[model samples]
Target: RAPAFPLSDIKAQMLFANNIKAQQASKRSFKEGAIETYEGLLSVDPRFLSFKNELSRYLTDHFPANVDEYGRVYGNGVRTNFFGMRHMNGFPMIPATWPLASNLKKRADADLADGPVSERDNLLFRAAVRLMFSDLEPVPLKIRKGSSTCIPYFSNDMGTKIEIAERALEKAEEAGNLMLQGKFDDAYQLHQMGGAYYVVYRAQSTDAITLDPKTGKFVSKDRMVADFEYAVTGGEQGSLFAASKDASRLKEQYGIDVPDGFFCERRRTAMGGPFALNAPIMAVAQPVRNKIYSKYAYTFHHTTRLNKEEKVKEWSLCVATDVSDHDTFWPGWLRDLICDELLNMGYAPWWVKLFETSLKLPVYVGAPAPEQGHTLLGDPSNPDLEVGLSSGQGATDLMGTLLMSITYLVMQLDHTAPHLNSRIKDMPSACRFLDSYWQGHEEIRQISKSDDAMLGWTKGRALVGGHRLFEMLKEGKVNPSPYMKISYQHGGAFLGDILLYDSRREPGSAIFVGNINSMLNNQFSPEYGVQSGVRDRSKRKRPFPGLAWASMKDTYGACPIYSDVLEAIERCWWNAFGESYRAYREDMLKRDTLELSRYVASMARQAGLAELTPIDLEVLADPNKLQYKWTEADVSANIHEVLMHGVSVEKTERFLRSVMP
Candidate 1:
């Protein structure tokens, strides 16, 4: 059959396009399959039902719509993930993240698609691969890895590869530390260029609490659900960036068009603490007792206004809700009290949803008394970037969620202060105590003296971390907050994936990135974004320049904070818990992969996509199955040289054919 369009050299573009069309047609099937999978599991366990309503409702409203941007219809904020709170409060941060252990839908569809097929079983996998990764050129190129045999690398030209790498890195970088590989919620889905549609749900069943991979602390297991649709060509990305000139280059060069509103939300993640992973807060010093420890919601990135802002006008927006369920208060009082406000301010679904999304456990980004910092944290949750989007009436205007929060707190303070006036005296002395503390520490004083304020946490462990905090935070003390989630983020870039940075971004913000050249020349590099601190490598072979940000720490001391907090934690806590933590993780490692394999088999059976037998399914599930290696054609080498020097073409077509899967 002839393709409706001209074929690229690989001749699979139409095949890939049709596969995507077919995949989109099956969304309801996947949705229903998911419903059944969860329903069956919930029926047997009942434990998963703890936050059933929370997740059930969450899936419909707040599950990220469109992988990069929301599929919205004239809505106000979700264009920026309701001000980038989706990932901030995106998943149950058992400490990093927890995507739902969705039934592995990977039938044999990807065997040939992933590489030369000696071991794959299903034909459907090819279509899945083509649709999900439409931008991946067919390459017989192999990777040099721990594996010896050549497994095909999804090779793209250096121009193409860098374009691909930067966007995923941007999200992974900006979110500071989020849905990482170890946590099994690595939501860095790439490509989906022409477009793909899917849903994202991080479901949790009633199970015992689990320890965080990073801090080893036990956290909640409420399902944080999402529905994501890749903004198909010419569709509304629900972002303001769609209007930017950068979007034009994507449409012209590639069939992609998107808005910058997505990046607007990415930067709003303010509850940012430091992380072991390369991140924005990598080295710039946080307070001695900042988010280095938070007993609850360790990943809640933004902070609220502590001192009531006089500018907090008693703004009124009519809203209402039936969620009188006091259990909502189990997480927040004003969290629920604010729920009362949301019911009144209930204008958009995302507007109400942001409340449910944000107000979880008490622990959050804060300006601790000991720290005396209120960097006015908001989206992207960067710890060091102070007085940002949430500092004053200036930024609060951008986020109604924070605005309402600040205004309500102000009202509450005024209302309650009269009540406290009778007994509360010399709170001024307490204030003076904090001033004296900051006045003493020079570096801390520098942070305080500037408009920049240091970030801290509300977790019980923030300052008062002795025996009492640890005792209360131990696993046995709380509910069986068990739901190890996994976020399958359809992370991608195309016309729809550009991000714009906003000092006060409304519809118009400066270009963070519009295209490949924009990425190199734009302000999205390793400056504020933390690069991996492994730069001391003695001229070791590494990923190309796109990913070279990882080495910036040792090179230019670019990301100076890369190796701080985690090392302290390693020395301090790992001494006490390292051996046990590793043992637990080893056990978890086995389960994670085994379960991953098992999940594939089970879902394949349910989907009726697997033709494999029980033994065959198990065989395919082995993590150590034979993989591919690549020895590139000379033209591929020339392509690299081509990228390093100057202009383009011919090499990509030659490179595509030199190795045929």
Candidate 2:
């Protein structure tokens, strides 16, 4: 008889394995396949359940009956307090716009679209719509007084507003001058300083609004909404640059006929972080500058205020840092707490869902240590106030089920490929070692002061071994002739098939295969191998495990157990872990592809590579520029170029033999 199931990609097979593992691993009422069970999961956790109730209440109370002819519901002039939170004012736009972007329904449809939408499924879909549609304020809405006049608030350290403003202007002028002289590094430094001072100015200046003394309510403007629609076009002079001339551009090029209030919001949203991504080369430095500076300024202001006024601790956003290290405690965590205070100030749903389900630990519920340095005040066990729900705990029946699933799979695989036991068993661990080594190198390069200093330690063992390996090969010590017969599927078509196949796998499970490929390629190029140190300070240090093994014969003498075993291990590991890094790269490509092209063209144009023509600019901006051809020549050339500067017979031959039969 033929096999029971059709052949599928390795990733699909792995997901099937994971699903089986997850299913048998626990008898938690909350199952992955059913959405109704999600309620059970939600109800157990007070945070998610409270959030659920809030969403239901909002939808029930304010669902619009005036559906448009186009199946659209317009939520105009909604008040911020409608959601019972100061931070989440917008009603219709929040749920409505988010569902469109999040595509929650589409995901559900993709899973069950083949069959008629069951009544249960239909009900589940409606529930999801309610959850997504309701006001859930992830980003805090800035509150303002009804007064039209802009209030001036200065930082504690800064002497005066004028002094701070002058400092910001001076730094900007210097940054601009440096860019004009093509001193990008120097320009970046000035830009960073300018950004830091500006944040310092804003931090000190921001007027933290309080509730009206008599009415006991805070009045604020409409909720802010940002869109990246304008970035789709606006190529050369991107959104940020255009924002300055928004009045003229909105009137002329954009042809937006809208109220002044609406235009102000639109222009405000179009600028800042989104524009920072589009900022020209000189402006590209703005984002990194913004991240480092803004955080520092926020931390400084909050700390300073906390020390002076004790009352500010209750309402005012403050972060307490350790005196010794002065490290900003939970930067992201504090933001969450402040947003939580603004939205659900009461004992609301404290939902903390872990994505990596395999870990199977108790969900951390309720608030932690107070910012003012107090012990946990919230009752975890109080059913009326707060409740904790843990999904998976050690239970015998489910544990047995999990053991059976793994045992059966192992038995079946062992039965089929008993001869390849050693390689098969060691594949996952070996793959992990290589991947971790490469990642560690990258991280060290980013933070370490000197590459040579970094490499002198045990942490550099991977790279050092690689360099020594290549040196040994050049000296004709350890030969790869025996291993050269191992077949590698390096063809463009084959790899492309693998790439698309892997793309269909679990989104985050895909490993950094391209980084591994680069590491391997770099090993053979002695001129620019692991010992080359930092060629580009901005770039990270990559590893060379292939090169490391070649030289460290005594250490790794038994590493490759003949050609077939090594080949089997490589093939299995790559099939299991090799993933498309396109997702990470494509995020930038989607946002800044055009802006990046313009920056590159500007660089070339200044360098006098060629006259920047319309056609040339269009070609550079083409979306296809971001994709990988995966062609042998392209791959070979790219690898060679990344390893050193160019292709060579010696390096090329060594790389090919190392990678392919």
Candidate 3:
């Protein structure tokens, strides 16, 4: 078996197509690297070491470690192995009869029961995960890395969860339909039978409605705006909106109108609603801290806790009540303006057309923002202006969070007495968090930590920075690599991504796992470049970078090559399922190399990596006489994957070395 491109497998890389052993070995390496990195960090950054000791000793001193007699509480019950008292808050509890309560207890038991190194062993898992995945992608963002962590956790729910639950709830509504039913569409409606209420209102133009801060009475500021309280509805599939508020009636058109068994949505996806967060909102965020029961978890600056801290900044918050009315893009005029901004920012037309047709959610920034004539995207120089492109759904999500905070202000004016208002005071002036200086300072409530914080920025702006980066990489303005392909390992092995940089110098990390750009993001110039999925805090809605989301669309829908790659990956996986390990590995290697060669050659031509003339290309094009030469240049294969996924280095090889067994 001869090699396809070159003998130095060290010089090239491959996606995990061929050898399962290589993949397994790499996994082993990855885990070991993670473990060692933790140990290394213990020595260098002794705080982790201190934290480790603190974790154990704190666990040692429980809610009442003296209680050898285990009093069984309810659901939040049961914890002995160094964790009977981690959460000092009102512990979640349940009775023994209810089997569900045991699940939590059992999980704690599982953690403790397993050879019982318990808390200390968490280092291995956390250090490993630190490279595999980071929370930066899972939630909304703010101005800094830590903003998402500091915000109230309960902020971004209600919308997305309810929508999904309703679909299943509809099944319960239609349970009686089967007994009286002849066909699917003609079933009787019964949501009203279960005491359902239809809440609908469209009210706007409520100008200057405010309350006097000192005397709790309604007053008018000079400000004015519309208050038509409806963004949209989930009416019938008929002409205009629906006639009734029956889920049964809506079922008349639901998933029954068109083919594919009537999809819940046309494209599909989000958290809140047709608008909140599913598809687009996924492209978009909240915070945690302070909870009474389960629902009261929220971020508050007005409390004495925050007041103890001098530099604590109160952020702008609001929500978008109405959005996602139609299939085609809604609100043409507003989108047009955003497009103008995108174009002015130098975004290209290729990836732009398909995204522009989607809806954009309007974020209502609280009291002062609207009164002073501002939205989240009010001005170019507004709060967050940085590298990521958010055309697909980040805009929609950004709006929901922005508007949510705004409503909190209105609620205080309309509902609260001046005394209680002191507790939940109106956020009249929203503090905008830009990319320049300090973010989320807390002295009394917490300590002063730092962050890799950034705020709102678009795709074109990032691309401008990206192209500049590629140029730097090409022109020797920065560091270099072989092929920018970021594969962890494969059976048809190519640890070439590992070759791109020095292992000991940088180290692998979770946030930047399988990504070179993120690993070396510090070298990215012009100050606007953000690795996709890094947090873009408001300073916190609750963190907003999301280029990976856009690339997901590209992988399956946007570009032909990316789609083909996905298909190839699917086939490779399927083929491996039906084949032997050796056969699969061999075939996977061949296919992987073939794809890599195609990728490298494609990138080479575009990047001018290979020295070539017209005559040389002609000779190269002659299939029989000449072969395409592989360059040692790491590059982008005209796909968004590079910008979408990036990585860490220093601890990588050390971890890898520990795992080589």
Candidate 4:
């Protein structure tokens, strides 16, 4: 009998074996007749529940009464008691039946226009099949697990499948390190493939945990899931860059327009945030003009109230160096505390740098002025470059006074104190040395020193920077700006802009806010707004207005952190965990892919998941697949979201379109 025509590719594969069977039956061609028979049988016995039994009996002990060998089958059908089990005989119809059923529904009505039989449709057919089998049922993509593919805040237990290609980069570092440690010989050199490995395992036909909704999270047993990397066109790393001026030719023809706010948010990001992936910390050194400090000189531009700043006549100075070695208190411990503080506050990276600078005053930067005490600790070219302010602020304000004051203190005391070296070393011996020195230097105003006074000075300084710090003090609190702004007196440029934007904007602060609301409180949302006054994609209109900051933590699908303060705070912890994960992912790679599979499954579960699964490891390994899922629709969607935000800033000017005067 001729077989019923396949309605889909899967149906095609299923029908292949049956077609061979009928052709071998008799010389008398039942060609068209066979198809009729098959269809009639399907209609009558739609639930050919016993199809397996029939197929088994038909194939058992049956030999061809015709041509021998190759083209013809001696055995008419599937084996009877196959593999030592009474296989419930359903002609192994699942392979054919399911696909045929699905396609049947898609069958075209006579009046409906025949969907294009063109090449594009043919291409879609291939893509659709690949998508259906990319993961667990095992098509062809390497699924990553753990930190390499893991997304924090995303629910892995609930089957939310989040797979950003760059997230896989966490593995590159691991791979790079392996190559570095000379372990390449023993390593399983991973291909720089596209799809994640977790996809393959979960989508496999027989996985440890396949989707069985009755007993699982999803709603269907017979289902699939996948997310192949959709490549950006115009041939640059980011679509934004490609769509920028450089790739103009290709962009006009094939590129997409970014949203109005996208450029704005991007501008803020470029200034100093996680998105500023390549902004380098400036480091420079040069001699300070001696005339600025030539007390008898004529270059005095401005003078502060020094009439009450009577010279210290002779005051006893007792220096107690009971300081713990910073390595013990700093690095992982103390830095961690301050880092946590900044992270909790929704501070961005720049802000965190400033906060840490204020709290710990270690003077990590390079040497100070030779007259003050030469010690190049931080970036040299930036001798007066404050350790905690934004580049503009560092240039203008001379760095925050709180920062400068503490930094100066640490540096000066190091030069003056006999036990200064001990500040960087063990504390016990350093303290003993300080006792004798204090006894000798006590009672001297000519060489004055006051730790408590400076601490008070800094406390006052911090208040002026602005955050509700003294709200707890009922009243009578002293303001700190005059003393605070003292640091900026020498620099000609205005320091306000730098301090407001530079010193305070922190990723850690944003991350912290996210943590409290997201990780801790479990509050979640999907839509997010972009910052305004940022670099806008289009130069001619007002960008959408929003808080002036940008965040990378995803706020789409099931989890969202919309507020700028919240986003920045959450980033701190995320980055912290990320830093550790990136550092130790190699050890994780040595572990199982099961957790990774689960993580991918979780992401798939989220986003009202539709046909999602891992990619075939083989396909992922192939470069051809890297170029697989590009589409105009995908690009358009990204543009849509970005434009929801409007333009806001114009620093480089070129990066932003003129939204307003």
Candidate 5:
């Protein structure tokens, strides 16, 4: 007879028993193989025996039908008799009978065994064996880069702005319907209006603002204002407030007494203001808007560019939130041209009527066209003040694509590893993590319940500093690893780069990868500018002193645990799927190296260099060697004797022949 013990006690004891194996492996004596193998085994033999006993007892209780001399156990009875060890802890286990039915040779090679004894002690030992061998269940969700779901706007040509806006309006209406159905995750509007891109997503909570019947103006409680967060407004800042009828309407509504020198064009597209009114006009914003532009309207009549002398005075007009402080003139021909197109595109009757009423406002009739008479409009005179609406595209599209990828990964888990699927539905925080945009909206909803700081439109904020992890690894100071080194060397060149950069534009596919501008500055400078994402060498005479490592860390930290989890899965998928994942990677390196060798061979031939042979080309293309030294320019340079020599010059010829034809 054997003594009984609780399963919890048995598991705890086994855990400690396993801990000793790790401890023993770390000992100096064991590491050096000192005092023979017997001495090493003797050191931790006591803990091993204690662990062995707990395992034996646990097996006796759980799998009495099958027990073996080597502590291997199997289930023989019905489901009621089996303790479900086959699917314990969300991992699959080898069946007790799995060891015996194989060929005798297979059985001898087995790590587990079938029933070979019936006694309590034998059963206990087998249960112990089972406990020692298992695998961990995968986490339910993971996020990885995928094709972006962004759709570009139509042309910015004056002849087509309204036509494009109308097309976008239809899409926004469809997105609105999706929002009404509680499909907020799928509800997003990518539209262009007034030369700006508006990427709006539905909020988790509804807006509480209403028009006051007496004043015919919008009004809401401060608490409600805090909850109404929606900033999908991306692209240039002046796109909305620059030379447009829309800006004129807003200026008039807020009492901006325009200077007569400021051009105000009339007639043509009727300048509908309904889009402005129907849009979610946060009630708490009126005062903020008035405060930003109410004092006066200044006109600059620079024949050349607005110089630095004028920039300081103009920048003061920049509002608290950093809205642009100036506007420019557009061709007078563009005015009626836009109007004719809107009407030709069949502007909704209500839209035409709304603009007609707005055009009649006294602000337009009072101000005369500039003396130059509708000069072509231009971007901000000070390059520092130019803003792009698409600045927020990377972060917004990344969130959408990541969630789309997760939804795909979860569906994969449901099919490939159902056990892990259990209890996943209970985790709302995970849901919010996967759907962070909605998560932000929910926070807005809660904050709206009580007055605090109201939510500002997160319009151009995404690019202010997120979704730059790939660029960070490349341009930011990072501790380089094998993967980071290779990917950076490839630069926007492969699927792996696309997977990491979040620049692929499609719903479910990942393809293109490229650089974009940072949202922090309105300069529209490339996010992956020369030395670092932050610095624009073209704009600055010198390189940024160094990369911003903190920004890199911030981008990395912003991702959810699932993104990390999924990354590991992606890293190991080939190996887990019965293929040699390492072998595949090595094969890819060989191919890349061969291609680089051919390229280098051509460069050498082009330079008419006879000193370099196939050997030199091979050395240049060697994956390990190239990964450590070559830059894009270095790779481009022709191979010559001393100029192209590497530390491993001895191996150059040997490696070159291996890769060369």
Candidate 6:
């Protein structure tokens, strides 16, 4: 029972190798990490089939296991995860029958039923009820998180039950009438359909038609009809209510197959649980909210019921057209937020115009941002700028949305009366109005592209400032785990710039060496010492504060073997940090040391750039083979220099600058 290497278990090692290889990092890292980890793991278990195949292939090719170095020296063409498209939107729903069944179950439990009792309606309803009652479709989709057993519901036909109900109500009204002659009943019946209706009415006032839910008076029209139309038909102002009630009564009275429990017996059906539907739209997003609570039914619980409030407001302003084609980043929620501004300001007309224009515009902002923040060579002034680069599909989606909206607009114009020219003109003005809004968006995208100091690369999946660049990075599928791509962009340039920062040198600075200097003075210094990612303590340390006192440089230094863009950015940051050494002198250094040390030991939170993770002196003395590239020779030389001369923190500044631009 002796272990191979000081308690190392071969079987355990193989499992570790397998697990490492399965990580969502670069295949190169996986390949290399797997090789190393597997070599370690195989020392524990040599017979793992999957690990052996991968190990055998790499060994056959005589491939080196150091992928970080390889990627740095050879670019990320070899890294499987290196792509330009970012997948910003998270996982999506798959179309399945569970959602449909759940929806039907909800309707049934609400004491609500659909149809004039047609074959299609009857079958679907019966199926849903039977399935739910029998535990076949026992749970609602909304109540289950990640339940693969439930079919994903995306029923275009069934989802919009409200619209169907409206149309059906209109048709039945024309057909007949039923009301209990001014008497109120519990459930309004669907005369021809064997269903029921829930109706509401508002007393007429100056604000009746143009009522704003936030400020308007609301009254319920709950009286049900027992006789079709005739019982309450003659009233002019209340005709709609009367007709609806009468129809309800007719449905209940004429129904032939009334089961024994249908009228008087109390029936018990599960209502699931109370749900806060708007929370998904408000504080928590749909994806997040879907994960919380099981077997519960939640409705939007806001006092201003969103649908009713929004519809009433928009209808009064006459911009309440269907916006099914509209697809913005946040869709209904974001649009509602924007519209709230207009509503608050009492610009109903402007709000309508704005909504129409926005719906007509495309969703795309534009190309992947050139400046990303987290990559090795990424710009860090505007950190997280290119975090989630999209695949440019947003532009296509927006284009499609606009096209659909335009077609609908054209149709509306064609159908409206000649005197409706004023209303028709809304389309063209709305189109013109859209130009300004989109122009602003385009300008923002351009700003993100041009400003290297803007720190465009580090940004990730979530949209930052609503910039298209973030979308591009996401769509591009670029990620920072293992080795980061941004390091490649900024690190080499930073090191090169630092290597050349010595003004008295003969060759001066390479273009790569001079880039950070140029960036600091012209782009970043005025902000935060031109920090690709570094932070400045004061205005003096701000990049280029004393530009005339030192040499300036710019260059795209070669990425070291095993480096990625994040390392590049970090190197650039270090270079900037080096250029800042002049300010770290005398009592100021002492003061900084005291403050930083105090903060390090006791400060629970950080302001900008507070060091996280205590300084790993062991790793500092020896460059991180995984995160950085330093040969045994390089580490030996540095260690020798430090031990003999008593290592000065100043050397780190010099080393960092030597790595820049």
Against the unseen true structure, what C-alpha lDDT does each candidate score? 0.21, 0.21, 0.21, 0.20, 0.22, 0.20
What are the TM-scores, per candidate, against the unseen true structure?
0.18, 0.15, 0.19, 0.16, 0.15, 0.15
Top candidate, metric lDDT: 5
Q: Please, what are the lDDT tens digits per residue for candidate 5 over residues 1-661?
A: 1111221332112211234432231121201000110112221132322322232234324433322221112222111121111100111011000000012222223221222222322222222212111111111111111111112221213223333333333444444344335343243222311111111211111112233558754332221110001101111111211122221332354344322111111111101112221121111112112221122111101110121112222111110000010011111112222223334434432332222221111100000122211110111111111111112221211122222222222322322233433324433433333233222331110001001101112223222221242244335364212101111222221111111112222112222211111110101111111222322222221122112211222222322222332233234433334454234434544443333344344533233223433224322322222222222122323543212221222332232222112
lDDT of 3 by residue, 1-661 (tens): 0011111232111211234532332122101000111112211122322332333233323322211111111111112222211110111111001001011222233232222132222222222112111122222221111211000011222332333323322332242233223221121122111100001111111112222458754322221112211111111111222111111222253222111111110111111112212222222112111111012112222211122122212211111111121212122332343444334434333222212322322221111111221112111111111111222342442332222222222222222212322222221111111101112221101111001001111222232333343244234443221101111111010111111111121112101112121111111111121222333221121111121222233212321123333343344334434434234334533432333234343453224313323222222221111111111011222221211221122222222222111
Worst 10 residues of 3 by lDDT: 92-101
- Model 1, span 164-268: residue lDDT tens: 323322333322123211221122122121111111222221222233569843333232221111111111221112111111233353343322211111111
Off by over 4 Å in 4: 1-181, 184-263, 268-527, 530-661
Number of clashing residue pairs in every model? Answer: 57, 8, 81, 105, 17, 126
Model with the higher lDDT, candidate 3 or 6: 3
When 1 and 6 are scored with lDDT, the better candidate is 1
Q: How would you encode candidate 6's per-residue C-alpha lDDT over 1-661 as one tens digit per residue?
A: 0011110333212111233321111111101001111112221122322222232233223322222321111222122211101100111111100001012222333332232132322222222222111211111111111111100111122223223323332332222222112111111122122111101111110000111258543222232222212111211112222211111221254432221111110111111000111111111121212221112111111111121222122110111112210121112222232333334334333212312222221111101111210111111111111111111111222222222322222222222212322322332344342332222221111101101101111122211322333233334354211111211221221111221112221111211112222222222111111222334221112211222222111022221222333233334334534333234322332343343333233433333223321112222211222112211222333222221221123432232222111
Q: Ten consecutive residues with minimal summed lDDT in candidate 6? A: 92-101
Query: Which residue pairs collide, candidate 2?
Result: 47-349, 47-350, 80-89, 95-133, 465-548, 466-547, 466-548, 469-551
lDDT of 4 by residue, 1-661 (tens): 0122211333212211243322222111211000111112321122221322232223222321221211111112111121111111111111110101011112221121122233322222222222211121111111112111111121221122222222222233343344334343222124121100110010011101112437633111222211111111111122211111111222253343321111100001001111111111111000011111122111111111111011111111111111111111111122333344334434334333422332221111111111211111121111121112222211111122112223223323323332343333333343343332223232111111111111111122222321222221112253222112111111111101000011222211111111111211111110111212324312112121111011112211112223432333244324433343222323332221222233233433223212211122211111122122211122223222322211111221221111101
Off by over 4 Å in 3: 1-578, 581-586, 602-661
Backbone steric clashes in candidate 3, count: 81
lDDT measured at residue 382 in model 6 versus the true structure, 0 to 100:
13
RMSD over all Cα atoms, model 1:
28.0
